[PDB]
Design a protein around this motif. Structure first.
Motif, PDB file in Angstrom:
ATOM      1  N   UNK A   7       0.694  -1.037  -0.042  1.00 54.88           N
ATOM      2  CA  UNK A   7       0.142  -0.066  -0.013  1.00 54.88           C
ATOM      3  C   UNK A   7       0.710   1.256  -0.032  1.00 54.88           C
ATOM      4  N   UNK A   8       1.840   1.470   0.823  1.00 56.50           N
ATOM      5  CA  UNK A   8       2.429   2.591   0.872  1.00 56.50           C
ATOM      6  C   UNK A   8       3.522   2.661  -0.293  1.00 56.50           C
ATOM      7  N   UNK A   9       3.997   1.683  -0.798  1.00 56.02           N
ATOM      8  CA  UNK A   9       4.745   1.516  -1.919  1.00 56.02           C
ATOM      9  C   UNK A   9       4.112   2.242  -3.156  1.00 56.02           C
ATOM     10  N   UNK A  10       2.621   1.820  -3.145  1.00 58.61           N
ATOM     11  CA  UNK A  10       1.963   2.335  -4.377  1.00 58.61           C
ATOM     12  C   UNK A  10       1.718   4.139  -4.161  1.00 58.61           C
ATOM     13  N   UNK A  11       1.442   4.228  -2.731  1.00 56.47           N
ATOM     14  CA  UNK A  11       1.262   5.650  -2.520  1.00 56.47           C
ATOM     15  C   UNK A  11       2.523   6.540  -2.601  1.00 56.47           C
TER      16      UNK A  11
END
Ligand SMILES: COc1ccc(NC(=O)Nc2ccncc2)cc1
Ligand SMILES: COc1ccc(NC(=O)Nc2ccncc2)cc1
Ligand SMILES: COc1ccc(NC(=O)Nc2ccncc2)cc1
Length: 282
Positions: A7-11
Motif C-alpha cells: 500500500x505505502x509503495x503504491x502511495x
C-alpha cells in the motif's frame, strides 16, 4: 507482497491508476446475452452494466425470468452475495420477488435515493408503519415494522408477505447513508463499523440465502463491501494472513459480475478498509 507495505509503495510511487488499469485488462469477459434482449431494455439502469449469463439470478417466472443481478460465490471463504442494481420503477416487484425466492435475510443499500440532484434508485420500501406497499405484479406485501436511525447508517425491520401462500418473513434493511456524493470516505472506520453490524445480524451466514447488496449500478460501492468482507474472512481462516492478495480476490469476484470497483480511488479505499479492519479483529 504483503498488503500494508504494498500500500505505502503504491502511495509513494503514485501508481494507483496503473494498478487499477492492470485489473481492468486482466478481468474476465463472459457473455451477457439475456441482459441485451430488446424485451429487457427497461429492466437495466445502465447499458454498460449487465449480469453475465452464467451467474445471473433467475426469477421463478415463465414469462420473463430476467433481473439485473449476479450470484458471487466465494468458494474458499464460504460466503455468497447477490449484487444488483438499485431497483427501477418497473423492477421494484422483481426485486422483492428475488429476495423471497432466494431466501435472503438482509438487504444492504449503499446509496441515497437522490444523489447529485438525480434519482439513483426507486423508493422501494415503506417510510411509515401504517402505509404498507403492495406489489401487484409479483403478489407481495411489504410493511415497515421498526426503524433505528444512527449517525452513519439506518437499520430497518421489514415484513415481507407472499400473498399467494400467506407466508411471512422478517427482512433486515441495512442502509449506509453517508457515502459522499463524490469520491470515497476519508476514513474507513464508519464503513467497517457498518460491515460488522451486518455480520452481527446473521444476514451473511450460511443458515440464510445470500445477502442482497446494491448501490446505483451494483458494482462500485457494492464491490467494495463484498471485497472487504471476503478479504477479512480469509485473513481469519488462513495460517498466514499476509498471503491474502486483494487484487487476486477482486479478479476472482469479477468472474461473477463485471466492473466491480469502478475507480482507482475505490481500489485504494478497499485496501485501507482491509488494513484497518485486520487490526480491530484481533
Ligand atoms: C414504482 O412504481 C410503482 C407504482 C405502483 C405499484 N403498485 C401499486 O401501487 N399497487 C397498488 C396497491 C394498492 N393500491 C393501489 C395500487 C408498484 C410500483
Ligand atoms: C415510496 O413511496 C411509497 C408510497 C406509498 C406507499 N404505500 C402506501 O401509500 N400505502 C397505503 C396503504 C393503505 N392506505 C393508503 C396507503 C409506500 C411508499
Ligand atoms: C413501487 O412502489 C410502490 C408500490 C405500491 C404502492 N402503493 C400501495 O401499496 N398502495 C396501497 C394502498 C392501499 N392499500 C394497499 C396498498 C406504492 C409504492
Amino acid at each position: 507482497m504483503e498488503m500494508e507495505k504494498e500500500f505505502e509503495q503504491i502511495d509513494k510511487s503514485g501508481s494507483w491508476a496503473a494498478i487499477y488499469q492492470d485489473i481492468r485488462h486482466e478481468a474476465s469477459d463472459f457473455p451477457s446475452r439475456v441482459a441485451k434482449l430488446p424485451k429487457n431494455k427497461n429492466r437495466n439502469r445502465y447499458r454498460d452494466v449487465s449480469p453475465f449469463d452464467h451467474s445471473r439470478i433467475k426469477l421463478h417466472q415463465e414469462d420473463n425470468d430476467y433481473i439485473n443481478a449476479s450470484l458471487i460465490k466465494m468458494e474458499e471463504a464460504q460466503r455468497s452475495y447477490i449484487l444488483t442494481q438499485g431497483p427501477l420503477p418497473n423492477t421494484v416487484g422483481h426485486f422483492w420477488e428475488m429476495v423471497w425466492e432466494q431466501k435472503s435475510r438482509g438487504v444492504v443499500m449503499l446509496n441515497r435515493v437522490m444523489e447529485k440532484g438525480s434519482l439513483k434508485c426507486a423508493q422501494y420500501w415503506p417510510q411509515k408503519e401504517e402505509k404498507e406497499m403492495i406489489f401487484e405484479d409479483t403478489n407481495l406485501k411489504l410493511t415497515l415494522i421498526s426503524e433505528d436511525i444512527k449517525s452513519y447508517y439506518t437499520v430497518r425491520q421489514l415484513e415481507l408477505e407472499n400473498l399467494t401462500t400467506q407466508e411471512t418473513r422478517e427482512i433486515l434493511h441495512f442502509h449506509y447513508t453517508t457515502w459522499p456524493d463524490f469520491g470515497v470516505p476519508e476514513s474507513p472506520a464508519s464503513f467497517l463499523n457498518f460491515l460488522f453490524k451486518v455480520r452481527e445480524s446473521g444476514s451473511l451466514s450460511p443458515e440464510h440465502g445470500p445477502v442482497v447488496v446494491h448501490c446505483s449500478a451494483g458494482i462500485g460501492r457494492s464491490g467494495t463491501f463484498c471485497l472487504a468482507d471476503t478479504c477479512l474472512l480469509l485473513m481469519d481462516k488462513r495460517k498466514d494472513p499476509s498471503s491474502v492478495d486483494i487484487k487476486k480476490v477482486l479478479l476472482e469476484m469479477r468472474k461473477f459480475r463485471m466492473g466491480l470497483i469502478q475507480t482507482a480511488d475505490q481500489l485504494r479505499f478497499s485496501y485501507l478498509a482491509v488494513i484497518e479492519g485486520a487490526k480491530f479483529i484481533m
